[PDB]
Amino acid sequence: GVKCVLVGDGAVGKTSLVVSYTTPTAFDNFSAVVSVDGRPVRLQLCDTAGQDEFDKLRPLCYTNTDIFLLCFSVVSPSSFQNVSEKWVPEIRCHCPKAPIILVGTQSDLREDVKVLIELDKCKEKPVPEEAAKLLAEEIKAASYIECSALTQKNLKEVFDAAIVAGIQYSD
Ligand SMILES: Nc1nc2c(ncn2[C@@H]2O[C@H](COP(=O)(O)OP(=O)(O)O)[C@@H](O)[C@H]2O)c(=O)[nH]1
Ligand SMILES: [Mg+2]
């Protein structure tokens, strides 16, 4: 059984990722049995609040973590910038050994006019997939995987990858 913790800025879609996949509050735990490469594995999902108010409690959730899903929204460059500035340092402070998968969320919004118009008011654009992939390399993430809890694009893949990385580490 594999312990997976999701971290990242508020509003990127952490809670939505886990609920979409496994099917109303700050911190919550989920448990699912998942078929990975043909055999069942128990996956514990710990959903954390990403607001600065925490690190109060948040790192208390980290004990014995096998895999971190470090999430940013692909339509939030600020959340991408926080991967380097806040999240990788925090994870590495508490669990320096644990594998990380860099997870880009809300992929469907790359094609949402309202969202794109809003980003452009500050001359921003969605995070290029190339940039995410390069960062994943820089931070020594296992991989970069981009997904949508709305359309379920790559949602299975995110958690399959989490389990594979998590078993390898655990073992
Ligand atoms: N369009 C779209 N909206 C999403 C997606 N994932 C989450 N949301 C919405 O984004 C907001 C933040 O989601 P939430 O699960 O609360 O994020 P968290 O704060 O990181 O846990 C909510 O309005 C969700 O409905 C997605 O993949 N696509
Ligand atoms: Mg949430």
Side-chain angles (χ1 to χ4, degrees), residues 14-16 25-26 47-48:
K14 306 178 289 303
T15 301
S16 297
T25 187
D47 184 18
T48 67

Side-chain angles (χ1 to χ4, degrees), residues 17-55 58-74:
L17 197 50
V18 49
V19 179
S20 179
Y21 178 66
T22 61
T23 70
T25 187
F27 290 77
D28 213 29
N29 289 299
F30 307 76
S31 183
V33 180
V34 188
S35 186
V36 177
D37 300 324
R39 49 70 154 96
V41 179
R42 201 180 311 278
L43 178 62
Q44 166 189 347
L45 296 166
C46 307
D47 184 18
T48 67
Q51 291 76 11
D52 284 359
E53 301 125 61
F54 308 93
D55 211 342
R58 182 192 319 117
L60 299 176
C61 299
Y62 290 4
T63 306
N64 295 329
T65 304
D66 295 309
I67 173 70
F68 287 87
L69 301 180
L70 203 175
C71 301
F72 69 92
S73 167
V74 303

